[PDB]
Design a protein around this ligand. Structure first.
Ligand SMILES: [Cl-]
Ligand SMILES: [Cl-]
Ligand code: NA
Length: 200
């Protein structure tokens, strides 16, 4: 599976990033990096179909990306979850959006990958880092072919960030294309793209 990005400019009214041409392959994680404000979110929201490209095209296995929305999982940089739902019910619900039925054991395997133990606790009782860990576990349960994660380990303790991200990426890169954003290059990502190269 290949995602082809050709001559891409992204933005709302005016372009913030331009001339992006790359081939993204299943199994090779792409990290788009730079300081907050450079256009990471805008780029990732365009790849995810939420935003229309200003120029260029994004084609997945020969088909326009907008025709394969059901195959895309996008995790935004914000942490917004239903506060009265349990961890396990949230995971079941996210999977159900993709028509996937998960049992409590598949749920626990995903939570184990991010070192979260209590399935029963309501999300509103958890810390932001813990909630982000649960969101990352949810990515492991869907049948998506394209994973686009904006600031995936936001809010997670600095000394735990890399352990968690590596754990997630190791699973997701076997399932599909993975694109993430961050503030720095990552040794464990196959492709690092500094967005300064494309900045207007
Ligand atoms: Cl940004
Ligand atoms: Cl944490
Ligand atoms: Na609770």
């Amino acid at each position: 599976s290949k995602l082809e990005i050709r001559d891409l400019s992204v933005g709302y009214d005016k372009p913030v990033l331009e001339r992006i041409t790359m081939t993204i392959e299943k199994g090779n994680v792409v990290n788009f990096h730079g300081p907050n404000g450079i256009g990471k979110t805008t780029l990732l929201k365009t790849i995810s179909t939420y935003l229309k490209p200003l120029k260029g095209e994004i084609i997945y296995n020969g088909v326009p990306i907008t025709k394969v929305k059901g195959k895309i999982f996008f995790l935004p940089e914000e942490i917004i979850v239903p506060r009265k739902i349990s961890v396990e019910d949230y995971l079941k619900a996210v999977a159900s959006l993709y028509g996937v039925k998960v049992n409590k054991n598949e749920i626990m395997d995903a939570l184990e990958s991010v070192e979260v133990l209590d399935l029963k606790k309501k999300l509103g009782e958890l810390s932001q880092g813990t909630i982000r860990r649960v969101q990352l576990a949810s990515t492991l349960l869907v049948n998506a072919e394209i994973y686009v994660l904006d600031d995936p380990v936001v809010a997670i303790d600095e000394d735990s960030k890399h352990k968690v991200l590596k754990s997630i990426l190791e699973i997701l890169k076997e399932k599909g294309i993975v694109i993430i954003s961050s503030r720095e290059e990552l040794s464990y990502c196959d492709v690092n793209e500094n967005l300064h190269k494309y900045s207007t």
